Amino acid sequence: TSPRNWCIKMVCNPWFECVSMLVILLNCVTLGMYQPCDDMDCLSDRCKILQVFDDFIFIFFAMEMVLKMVALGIFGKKCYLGDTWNRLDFFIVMAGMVEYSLDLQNINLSAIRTVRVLRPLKAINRVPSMRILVNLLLDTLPMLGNVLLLCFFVFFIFGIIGVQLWAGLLRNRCFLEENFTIQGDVALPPYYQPEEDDEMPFICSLSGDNGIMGCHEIPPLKCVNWNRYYNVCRTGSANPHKGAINFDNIGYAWIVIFQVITLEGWVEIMYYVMDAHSFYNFIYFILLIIVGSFFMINLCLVVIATQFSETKQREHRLMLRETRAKLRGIVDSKYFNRGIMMAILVNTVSMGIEHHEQPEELTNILEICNVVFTSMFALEMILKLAAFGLFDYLRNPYNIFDSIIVIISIWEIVGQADGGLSVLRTFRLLRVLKLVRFMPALRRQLVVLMKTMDNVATFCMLLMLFIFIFSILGMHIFGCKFSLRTDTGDTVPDRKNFDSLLWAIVTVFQILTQEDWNVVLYNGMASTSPWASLYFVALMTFGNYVLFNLLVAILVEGFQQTIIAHKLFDYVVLAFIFLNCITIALERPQIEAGSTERIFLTVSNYIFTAIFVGEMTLKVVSLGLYFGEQAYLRSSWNVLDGFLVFVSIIDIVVSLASAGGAKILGVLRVLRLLRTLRPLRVISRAPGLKLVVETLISSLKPIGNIVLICCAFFIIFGILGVQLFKGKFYHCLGVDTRNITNRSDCMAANYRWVHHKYNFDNLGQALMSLFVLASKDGWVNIMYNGLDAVAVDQQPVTNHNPWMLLYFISFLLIVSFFVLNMFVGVVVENFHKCRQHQEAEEARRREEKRLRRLEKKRRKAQRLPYYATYCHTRLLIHSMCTSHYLDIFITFIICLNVVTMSLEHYNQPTSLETALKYCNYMFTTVFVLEAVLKLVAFGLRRFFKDRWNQLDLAIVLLSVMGITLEEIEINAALPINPTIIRIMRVLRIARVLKLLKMATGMRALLDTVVQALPQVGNLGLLFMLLFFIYAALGVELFGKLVCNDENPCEGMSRHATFENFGMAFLTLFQVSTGDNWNGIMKDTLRDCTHDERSCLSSLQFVSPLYFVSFVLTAQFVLINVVVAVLMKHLDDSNK
Ligand SMILES: CC(C)CCC[C@@H](C)[C@H]1CC[C@H]2[C@@H]3CC=C4C[C@@H](OC(=O)CCC(=O)O)CC[C@]4(C)[C@H]3CC[C@@]12C
Ligand SMILES: CC(C)CCC[C@@H](C)[C@H]1CC[C@H]2[C@@H]3CC=C4C[C@@H](OC(=O)CCC(=O)O)CC[C@]4(C)[C@H]3CC[C@]12C
Ligand SMILES: CC(C)CCC[C@@H](C)[C@H]1CC[C@H]2[C@@H]3CC=C4C[C@@H](OC(=O)CCC(=O)O)CC[C@]4(C)[C@H]3CC[C@]12C
Ligand SMILES: CC(C)CCC[C@@H](C)[C@H]1CC[C@H]2[C@@H]3CC=C4C[C@@H](OC(=O)CCC(=O)O)CC[C@]4(C)[C@H]3CC[C@]12C
Ligand SMILES: O=c1[nH]c2ccccc2n1C1CCN(CCCC(c2ccc(F)cc2)c2ccc(F)cc2)CC1
Ligand SMILES: *[C@@H]1O[C@H](CO)[C@@H](O)[C@H](O)[C@H]1NC(C)=O
């Protein structure tokens, strides 16, 4: 109409969208200036003027809303409320309206002011690339419901188990005697806490509960052993971590299960449970990690990638002067280019040399070397501008880059006064970048990287919007609430606080990286209220398991003589290895020399070596070593076996030379190390593992380019880190650690000059620290040491140099992107391979698939026995009583049962327990009722043919057994061990599995997993084998690292040490998960007090290599498991 026609021109003007986006950004800026720790009551100039800007923004929002409705109409597909984000704009408009109205009413209500945080979210529709990406993501969400209901299963089952088992156990610290006698001066705390004010508790075990720590393992204080008086322990006070980790409710159990889903702070709470209740809870925690933490979130990645692929396909288908030439010859000589390559390589080698307290002569050598190299590069500059000419030089901008290097280098040489020495040295790294102009494959690889970034840009902008929104929200609800109490006289804020928007963003990024996010969780959820964990859950989930899987999907979709017998020899030699491996699983460095076990191990090694050399001889006489083709050494695995047997012979010969053991000890160490590799012949002597290892190696080459690029970035950033930090990572750890500046002041107080173990002195330690950063573990501590570092030899101060965040976050982001593109590379390769075959086999299956269609045509009607069940008092059971309306009843009763076990908690009112008992009776009776109905519906033919009614039978049998045993303790007929009742309550959870019948989508998803078990099982066997090899190596290497008070460990706490074999197999399982593995490495490389040669040994050279190789191999094996599942998923989606 005419009134609409007045404003359609303005509202449809792209200028209107431009000014809209501009006011969105200005609103974001006004939000950013919030200072919760400083902005109390808004009694300042900045506060009032920002309130004025927010008023203006609200005015503009109301104006744009009203014009858009009057010009587009209301409540219709073409009207204003047609598109989602128009409705969202409506929502924030009304929210601001009510906020302003309540502000007029003089009501503070800092619970609706927090709604402002949704305002930046309006920009999502004002950028078309963002619009289309978010539209696709929203459209691909609704197919994600299946994995989320799987999430509900694997949270609810374990939460019920936990609340039934460990309810309230966490509380029970260790108290004093009942009628205790003290002369006076009451300093004895009510219970015992080893560290001040209960951040590390001493959870005991009640009498009657078989815990492991039972209040007689307390440390004797070091006079008067006051601690020994802590005799008995009863419940009370608070659960551990400021009342944040417990299993009392089911909400708390869900919080804890979420924490161990993120694989952070895991062994801490596992050891709480072990302290309190039983030693056998590692089964509970490991079964959760394997299922809940790996087969769950990676199923989310698989489902998101697959569904996004098909939604992209769907939307796509919807559309459906003379010597110049002479000198030119020397330039492209194919020998001069390699000469300047060698020049640049030795230049970067020279650059990496410098370190802390470098030799006085060496720095002069380096500076003259720099002069030589810049002179050579300038010579190349002049010769190339001469033989080519000014225009020919500028034709390729790589020449421009080289000229830039030349000019900055000569400027650095000239700039010897000030300023230049601080920065122009730091630009020397660009000289390394000249290699790309030479190496060919590293041109196409970077080109395809840029092709990816072409689309990754919009996702990156989306990510920063998301992180900004959540940082604003956190800074609201947690603002100035993390004030850590006094420690040296003042309440120093936690470094992870939310007080300033800079710290808000860096803390939200920290949490997104899942490193020390539990510290923030506890320190926040004990500040506001226990419901504050929903914020962390929403952040971590919506970010990590949705947006990032979206990024992965974006990349993946973007890239589109004598007699010889060989009948059963392999199985028997595999048996012999099993035996050898259980001979290898016992050499703990604690068996006393000359014991029965030592002798048994020696003789077992003797016979096993005899058997293996015998089979080696058999094979070689069958084939021959290298005498022509098809010999013994024409295959890799035979070469490996020969290598192992040769090392075995060397070891036995040297061992028999034990006399004169001086100077050969290192040889013995190396020979033991190479012994531990012997459990690797299974791959050769088993077909599936052999094929899988070949497939791994084959998939390893197409990602080689990215690996080399990532290693180059590691070297570049390592040299950069050496440049920035030289010897700044020294801090005066003492009783005061205050009012002291430099080493001289520290020695004045005589405390100590402690040296951090993760530093940037050398380039090797630079690479170690960079690997720690890149693996998202313990990187916050390194970042704190980086920001705090002040100068060469004095105390770091808190946040001295907040600019290093750029380095410490840019490294994480770049390394993370390279790792993501490495995965995406594995998938593409594998798909290409299978797709090439696939169709061939599947064609024949489709020829058989129509036969299966013909098979169902046979199935039409074999006179089903409904009539025999008709008129026999059950004409209604078989037909009217087996309808879906009778199964909605069963599902509803299942949900009521779920929500009624979801109500148990510690110290519940007795009335609630009685009501739950009555509800259990109700539900058992009804389950019996439809069990009998189903049994009368049909005889025993289909009763054993359903394969699912048996599940109902088992459940009803468990339920009736449970209700029957309840009577036994009503009448006290027989003394029943409460363990039986425990098992029965905890097993009542089996009534949940009845939902699987209706959830056909979950059935399909779990199936798609199930027909991946060839590859998945072979990879799992490989993974166990890798743990075995690395555990044996670790036991041999770090076996004797004593952990006591005088050697305070950081990561190997109680059973995570390497002493035994299994105790090391656990710590390998812990390192693989990436929880406090950096702590374990710091524990190993630890100079001791000359108590042992292991501490003084070559640990520094070999411990980091051990840990890095293990972490890389474990992660790669897991990636290959995931890609196998994903390919089978795409194949199933094809059919
Ligand atoms: C390549 C990326 C993917 C991972 C980085 C691998 C590093 C963990 C490796 C390669 C460089 C090695 C470093 C080379 C040099 C050294 C110096 C070495 O000797 C020392 O300077 C400390 C002892 C001393 O001399 O006082 C300590 C081991 C270390 C850090 C090495 C740590 C382990 C390192 C093997
Ligand atoms: C192109 C579109 C899609 C980008 C959307 C993201 C922006 C809306 C976000 C990303 C970066 C944010 C900026 C990050 C940094 C700050 C600095 C901040 O100022 C302060 O740091 C003050 C700190 C203090 O006072 O203690 C003001 C908000 C602002 C500009 C933010 C405004 C909102 C920005 C631009
Ligand atoms: C996408 C949805 C499902 C999650 C998005 C996160 C927020 C919209 C929700 C989830 C967590 C909730 C918070 C949980 C904890 C806090 C602190 C909590 O502390 C108090 O009791 C202070 C009471 C007061 O004086 O306001 C009050 C509820 C609140 C603000 C909640 C506000 C709304 C939050 C941030
Ligand atoms: C079957 C093959 C293919 C590999 C299986 C080997 C391991 C999975 C098993 C078999 C031998 C078991 C080990 C047998 C003996 C020991 C020593 C044992 O040490 C002690 O308990 C001594 C301390 C004490 O007695 O109090 C710890 C368990 C452990 C490591 C066992 C851990 C689990 C092991 C390594
Ligand atoms: O959550 C995050 N925020 C972050 C912010 C910055 C940097 C990293 C961030 N992270 C990661 C943290 C852990 N987690 C999976 C790790 C690797 C994972 C993977 C690797 C590559 C890839 F392309 C997709 C998924 C994977 C999955 C299965 C495996 F078997 C091995 C490894 C999700 C991403
Ligand atoms: C070390 O700190 C003290 C304490 O103020 C100061 O006087 C001195 O100049 C500093 N530098 C030294 C001793 O080189």
Ligand SMILES: [Ca+2]
């Ligand atoms: Ca950690």
Ligand SMILES: [Ca+2]
């Ligand atoms: Ca981690």
